[PDB]
Amino acid sequence: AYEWGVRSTRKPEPPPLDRVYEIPGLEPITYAGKMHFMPGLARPVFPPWDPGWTHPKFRRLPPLHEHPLYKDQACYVFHQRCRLLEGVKQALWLTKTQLIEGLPEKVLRLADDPRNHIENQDERVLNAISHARLWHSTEDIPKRETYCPVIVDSLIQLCKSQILKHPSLARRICAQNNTLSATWNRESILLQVHGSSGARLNAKDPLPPVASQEEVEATKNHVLETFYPISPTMGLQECNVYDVNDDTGFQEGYPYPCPHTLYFLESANLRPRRFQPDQLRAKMILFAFGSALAQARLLYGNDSKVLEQPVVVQSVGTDGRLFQFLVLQLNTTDLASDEGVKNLAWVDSDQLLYQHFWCLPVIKKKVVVEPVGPIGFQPETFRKFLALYLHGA
Amino acid sequence: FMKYVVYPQTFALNADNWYQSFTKTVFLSGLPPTPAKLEPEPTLDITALREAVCDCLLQEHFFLRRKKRAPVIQDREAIASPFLDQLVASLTGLLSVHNPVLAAAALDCKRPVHFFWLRGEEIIPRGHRKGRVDALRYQINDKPHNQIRISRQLPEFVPLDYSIPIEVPVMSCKPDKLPLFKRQYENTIFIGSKTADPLCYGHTQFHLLPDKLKREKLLKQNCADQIEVVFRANAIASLFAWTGAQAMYQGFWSEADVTRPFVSQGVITDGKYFSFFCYQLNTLALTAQADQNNPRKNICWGTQSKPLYETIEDNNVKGFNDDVLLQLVQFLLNRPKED
Amino acid sequence: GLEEFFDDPKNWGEEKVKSGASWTCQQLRNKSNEDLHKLWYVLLKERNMLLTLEQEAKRQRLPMPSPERLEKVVDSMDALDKVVQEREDALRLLQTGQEKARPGAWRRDIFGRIIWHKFKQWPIPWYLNKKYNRKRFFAMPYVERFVRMRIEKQARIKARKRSLERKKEKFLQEKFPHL
Amino acid sequence: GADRMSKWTSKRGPRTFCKGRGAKGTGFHGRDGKFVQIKEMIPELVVPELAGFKLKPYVNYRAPEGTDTPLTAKQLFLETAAPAIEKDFKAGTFDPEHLEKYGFEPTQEGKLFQLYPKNFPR
Amino acid sequence: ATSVSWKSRTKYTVMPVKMRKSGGRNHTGQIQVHGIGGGHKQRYRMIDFLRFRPEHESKPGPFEEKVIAVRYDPCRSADIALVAGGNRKRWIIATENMKAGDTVLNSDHIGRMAVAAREGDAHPLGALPVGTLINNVESEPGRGAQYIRAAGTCGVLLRKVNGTAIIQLPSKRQMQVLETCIATVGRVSNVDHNKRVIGKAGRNRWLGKRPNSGLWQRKGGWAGRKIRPLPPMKSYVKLP
Amino acid sequence: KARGNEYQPSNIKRKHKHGWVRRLRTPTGVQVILRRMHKGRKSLSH
RNA sequence: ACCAAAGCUAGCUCAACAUACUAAACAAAUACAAAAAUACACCAAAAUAAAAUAAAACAUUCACCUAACAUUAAAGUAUAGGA
RNA sequence: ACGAGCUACCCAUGAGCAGUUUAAAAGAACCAACUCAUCUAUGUGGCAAAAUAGUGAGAAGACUUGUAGGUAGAGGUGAAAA
RNA sequence: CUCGCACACGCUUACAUCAGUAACUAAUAAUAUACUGAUAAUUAACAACCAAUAAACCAAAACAACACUAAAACGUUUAUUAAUUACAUUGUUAACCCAACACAGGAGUGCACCAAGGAAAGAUUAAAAGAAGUAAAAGGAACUCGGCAAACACAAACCCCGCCU
Ligand SMILES: [Mg+2]
Ligand SMILES: [Mg+2]
Ligand SMILES: [Mg+2]
Ligand SMILES: [Mg+2]
Ligand SMILES: [Mg+2]
Ligand SMILES: [Mg+2]
Ligand SMILES: [Mg+2]
Ligand SMILES: [Mg+2]
Ligand SMILES: [Mg+2]
Ligand SMILES: [Mg+2]
Ligand SMILES: [Mg+2]
Ligand SMILES: [Mg+2]
Ligand SMILES: [Mg+2]
Ligand SMILES: [Mg+2]
Ligand SMILES: [Mg+2]
Ligand SMILES: [Mg+2]
Ligand SMILES: [Mg+2]
Ligand SMILES: [Mg+2]
Ligand SMILES: [Mg+2]
Ligand SMILES: [Mg+2]
Ligand SMILES: [Mg+2]
Ligand SMILES: [Mg+2]
Ligand SMILES: [Mg+2]
Ligand SMILES: [Mg+2]
Ligand SMILES: [Mg+2]
Ligand SMILES: [Mg+2]
Ligand SMILES: [Mg+2]
Ligand SMILES: [Mg+2]
Ligand SMILES: [Mg+2]
Ligand SMILES: [Mg+2]
Ligand SMILES: [Mg+2]
Ligand SMILES: [Mg+2]
Ligand SMILES: [Mg+2]
Ligand SMILES: [Mg+2]
Ligand SMILES: [Mg+2]
Ligand SMILES: [Mg+2]
Ligand SMILES: [Mg+2]
Ligand SMILES: [Mg+2]
Ligand SMILES: [Mg+2]
Ligand SMILES: [Mg+2]
Ligand SMILES: [Mg+2]
Helix, strand or coil, X not given: CCCCCXXXXXXXXXXXXXXXXXXCCCCCCEHHHCCCCXXXXXXXXXXXXXXXXXXXXXXXXXXXXXXXXXXXXXXXXXXXXXXXXCHXXXXXXXXXXXXXXXXXXXXXXXXXXXXXXXXXXXXXHHHHHHHHHHHCCCCCCCCHHHHHHHHHHXXXXXXXXXXXXXXXXXXXXXXXXXXXXXXXXXXXXXXXXXXXXXXXXXXXXCCCCCCCHHHHHHHCCCCCCCCCCECCCCCCEXXXXXXXXXXXXXXXXXXXXXXXXXXXXCCCCCHHHCCCHHHHHXXXXXXXXXXXXXXXXXXXXXXXXXXXXXXXXXXXXXXXCEEXXXXXXXXXXXXXXXXXXXXXXXXXXXXXXXXXXXXXXXXXXXXXXXCCEEEEECHHHHHHHHHXXXXXX | CCEEECCCCCXXXXXXXXXXXXXXXXXXXXXXXXXXXXXXXXXXXXXXXXXHHHHHHHHHHHHECCCCCCCCCCCHHHHHHHHHHHHHHHHHHHCCCCCHHHHCCEEEECCCEEEEXXXXXXXXXXXXXXXXXXXXXEEEEECCCEEEEECCCCCCCCCCCCCCCCXXXXXXXCHHHCCCCEECCXXXXXXXXXXXXXXXXXXXXXEECXXXXXXXXXXXXXXXXXXXXXXXXXXXXXXXXXXXXXXXXXXXXXXXXXXXXXXXXXXXECCCEEEEEEEEECCCCCECCCCCCCCCCEEEEXXXXXXXXXXXECCEEEEECHHHHHHHHHHHCCCCCCC | CCHHHCCCHHHCCCCCCCCCECCCHHHHHXXXXXXXXXXXXXXXXXXXXXXXXXXXXXXXXXCCCCCHHHHHHHHHHHHHHHHHHHHHHHHXXXXXXXXXXXXXXXXXXXXXXXXXXXXXXXXXXXXHCHHHHCCCCCCCCCHHHHHHHHHHHHHHHHHHHHHHHHHHHHHHHHHCCCC | CCCCCCCCXXXXXXXXXXXXXXXXXXXXXXXXXXXXXXXXXXXXXXXXXXXXCCCCCCECCCCCCCCXXXXXXXXXXXXXXXXXXXXXXXXXXXCCCCCHHHCCCCCCCCCCCCCCCCCCCC | CXXXXXXXXXXXXXXXXXXXXCCCECXXXXXXXXXXXXXXXXXXXXXXCCCCCCCCCCCCCCXXXXXXXXXXXXXXXXXXXXXXXXXXXXXXXXXXXXXXXXXXXXXXXCCCCCCCCCCCCEEEHHHCCXXXXXXXXXXXXXXXXXXXXXXXXXXXXXXXXXXXXXXXXXXXXXXXXXCCCEEEECCECCHHHHHCCCCCHHHHHHCCECCCCCCCCCCCCCCCXXXXXXXXXXXXXXXX | CCCCCCCCCXXXXXXXXXXXXXXXXXXXXXXXXXXXXXXXXXXXXX
């Protein structure tokens, strides 16, 4: 085996102890008397130091096993920043869920009704894009870290403007950075989705289940795909100190108890610090799932049962030019077995809100070839966005 | 060239007078004269708004669980920021049922407002340019918690030539003794958005007071009156800048002055306490040459500070003030005139 | 309370402002601890005022009114100090019996000088201290040469100071032979 | 050729060089990077009420000085412990083991202001 | 003075780690090796050269891994492959045709029947056919791979005698090893690395190669074409 | 090209090369200090 | 007539003696980039003196040359040396 | 003993390169900043112990450049000119 | 006529106000940013100072859609502990630095090409020789080691040696 330190680096081994410490029944004479090093005298050995009163900052780090919440069962945690190696496959397997290509047809009908559009759609959305991508900053070319949250919030406002026509939308409240802890046991492997998502749109009243019974029972017959060499736990956090309690970010008696939509932004400048589109899809699967599982164990309780009343949660995700749409229906609180009814997830993937953007006129042979603005615009993606915002009313 | 950077949120003792000075602003206590021309609009539900606001307050101060803070000092910045964001976003829609303009509005979240202007003269004290004559320059870099931007302008609170007995305070000192410091970097006039944006006008601003300026801290420093001053100053700066920039987006500047008064509104808040300000910018020419014969002034009306709630306890909001809601409602009910 | 920085307005334009003698040590040994503690502040306020007047005299290009006060006051404070210190240094001699209020050791530094090293307060004991551990109290062998030189140099100086004094006596004896 | 003789000061170096003028540190750097002051490290002036008392910064000139006797450990022993010790040896109640009734302190680590390591500035 | 080597990191990571070149200078600061310095800036990918490395010591058996992606490496001439199994990932040297989305077996198990050899396969030497092509060859069992790592190199297993393998190194010298040592089966990646043409002196400088000296040295006796009988066979087998 | 500007001031370089701490870290340096102390130099070191 | 010119002091030199041999001054600060009160370490070490020069060059050699034993003689003797 | 704050080469860490031409940031082309130093004239105790005026070469590269570090004289460093 | 304003580095009071300049600094004066004295002064929001230990992350910067080869600086989150309590400390002048000089030289970065900075001539005269320039009849290299320099030219060819930057 090739070991990975280097002798030159590793903290130097203690100097070989002075020969006078090898002689039985003899007191070595040390410079410890004069409180400083002297040559000619032997090196003193001291007891590990105990400052009888403990200081909070300057003490040695308490070993992990001493904690009250310490447990010997390794628990695999999924937090906001974990990448899954096989994104959607793994996500599904951990979630015990079947994947369906399009969005639910309820949502598509909601999207294609000419009543549900804003005043001038192409105008307003081309403006929200131009704004987020150019006009919102003083600089020539704003970074992604600014413009991704700006565009998601711009679209949230374009949709929010519809509170005039369907005044049920005032039943919602938005929240930022809530503790979410969903513990569940799957196939002898302990899983916990634990952490904070960016932005969470909550509703006062729950969401109507979007799959007919034919879909649920057709889900009873589906076989989960498996990746043999890779364990399904790959990409998570092995953790020995954790709490198992169902926690949604809110205490009892919260006026807006029902999670509606989760928003996941990828704002990082560098490529390698963002998620592959797939890993992002995984992220929002597992987090949607935790969000749902929380409620599902609040309104029913810790017992593992198939659900007579399916819980539905939504999720959206972003490069800021690229959108990931997700709707999740949770049908099952017993994930221990592989063989029962599986939860359902619809994923509309890789929906481009626009092709490319130019913040400066691109000029060829002293003429203006391409003007400032977006190239190509899909009103479709914003249409779906609007739909998912409008799913309550 | 070299300019003074004016901070809207200030530790300096009386920054209200100084800022009035820099801006040529007159301050009048109490809200602007009520536009009795209002239609019988207020069909408003005060109970749905009590509810809607207390949802925010309670969500922040009680319900929502944050990853545990070791300080336990409970930074009022970290508590009140999401409260204010949620307050604006919530009231915006609820009152957007009544006031359709707020539907077409843009909501700005912590984004820069920059204004740069010239005021007065100076004989340069030191250096190789000592003795020559130069203008005093000022820059305000501001970051309001929230803005509301519209496609059409709000109406004037008083006419353009409206006159007042009260005179703009003339400081005898350099700005330096405020304290204020010179620095130089790019001078920007920026509204919260670039020129190319179709929404050119301001509605109201929301300023959350930073941690240093808490009523408690000031009470410890043997500063009583200052509690008020800090609010004033903030408004007088921010609003001015905003208005100023708006004006200069319309092509107006020191030698074009201004044809129609530019107005905007603002709310300044320690998480508990609120204050309401209205600002009318008339004169854009504060320049040495341009201010010689110029009669006009900029006017700023403001409210005494005042508590929203009293002592949230365990998912109950104990004291509550509807007057505060009513003024917030006033401001959010303003509209462009219709043709 | 800002006026304690200035003399009574009755004194302002006057050349000579008279005043008492400074405190002797002896008169202070008679006062209690509390009264010394107070007198220290009475003396403080006045010293402050006097310094203020001093600088303000320089500013106006004018001579300071009765400058001598500033001397007197200082001595008083100084004297007061000497007294209180006594009562501590007496006291600790009783209780502990150390002649020095600050812990310290006789050491030999890099340069071979024999130095008095004052101690310093640290939260951690001396062998765990990086910075202190990298001082060297001891000399290397080469230093021994330099030490010698020091002595010799010293010896020379003394040697020819002595010879000078001797000489000065002879000269005078032939200038003033009243013996 | 720079400057050898002139003393080294914070005014002299780069930006990175900050060296205080010798005031004492009142605190530490906290979490936010913001600085935290410890109320205990900031010197608390103990000031008596001067108003009701009669003494002045100067003394009358005809008032006499006195024979100058520096206080010694001995004189202080005689003004305090000697009357009590003689009183309790004459009464036979003298106990060479515990002298603490006379004001002797065996060890300094208990009390607030210690004399030998010298816990107090002034 | 004294410089510390950048080569200190204790825990294995697939993540690229940052490194400091030192053109030819030893830790004292003097030049040891001439003509090195100033290439492009490079990150370093830790390579696991022990191909058989059971994840947990609990289950010892021969295990199988998936090849996720095959990437260029700045540090070595061969192309390298990211390889994941169980909970763990590692960088291994990629065999010639190894491609993404692939399956690769790692086994310590010998048997009387040998094995049909695939490419990514790692087997003990004794378990292979006698004509096989091998790379990443251990010397002493449990040591980790040293020999035959360069791009497009392959040795060949020659014979098996007395519970011991005799292999042929790319320099065509013979090497005697225990048959208990692991090797990977195939030719190493990027076979055309030989035929690459550096176009311009600048390109050499990009590789961190400073030019030769300008000094003219007359050729010595060491120069000429020496024809030497091929050296005796190296044996890492320790006789009792 | 033109010469004599060879000294380009830095306080950091100065105090690292010739500073007190630098002189005291090696025995040779300590001997420098010792010599100057002997000769009675006003400034032992930078 | 300008520029100038004259002092006799400052101190020094060499020995004697002498106790004994790192002076004086230390409140704080001083080995962070000396003079910057306050945080878990590291710390430390030795190897022959060489050559210029003399030998009319230079190759073995070349007194004294930072190691206590002085003085009167034995004696520039016995010895040692490209003798 | 002291020197790499100049210079040679390195190591870290930053910073610059506009316009034009080209499918091209190709040790391509034109030409600034920038970097060099071709040829001539001045200058020769000079403005200068190596400069000035013109004129020239390179100008996304084996490019220029800031800051902090390294290598030391029996040595270092060197696209060798001792 | 046009090297301007700022910052870093470096300099350390050379900066400011009042007064003085017989002489001392300015290579002369007038007077004064530079000589003399006295008296003052740069105020933090900018800047420096300003947490460790585990754990998931293979996926460049180039308007980044996606790629090229030389394979690339720059962080999130999760967990475990992090004294908790207004106001800490320090840099803030200048016309400045390295060149022995108040030196036509050397000096990083950001913005500007003027709105900012500055003055080629102490006063005369209008000799030679010298320097820098503009113009020139007819001729057009006859000059000269060489079309060196200069030009209303700014093109073509051929060798030698080195492949090329
Ligand atoms: Mg010097
Ligand atoms: Mg400094
Ligand atoms: Mg500086
Ligand atoms: Mg503070
Ligand atoms: Mg390499
Ligand atoms: Mg390679
Ligand atoms: Mg070669
Ligand atoms: Mg050669
Ligand atoms: Mg020199
Ligand atoms: Mg000789
Ligand atoms: Mg001779
Ligand atoms: Mg000779
Ligand atoms: Mg000799
Ligand atoms: Mg012989
Ligand atoms: Mg260097
Ligand atoms: Mg270019
Ligand atoms: Mg080129
Ligand atoms: Mg030139
Ligand atoms: Mg010419
Ligand atoms: Mg040129
Ligand atoms: Mg060219
Ligand atoms: Mg060319
Ligand atoms: Mg160095
Ligand atoms: Mg030799
Ligand atoms: Mg050499
Ligand atoms: Mg040669
Ligand atoms: Mg100087
Ligand atoms: Mg002055
Ligand atoms: Mg003069
Ligand atoms: Mg300045
Ligand atoms: Mg002249
Ligand atoms: Mg002439
Ligand atoms: Mg001529
Ligand atoms: Mg001509
Ligand atoms: Mg002619
Ligand atoms: Mg001819
Ligand atoms: Mg001829
Ligand atoms: Mg020519
Ligand atoms: Mg020609
Ligand atoms: Mg021609
Ligand atoms: Mg060539």
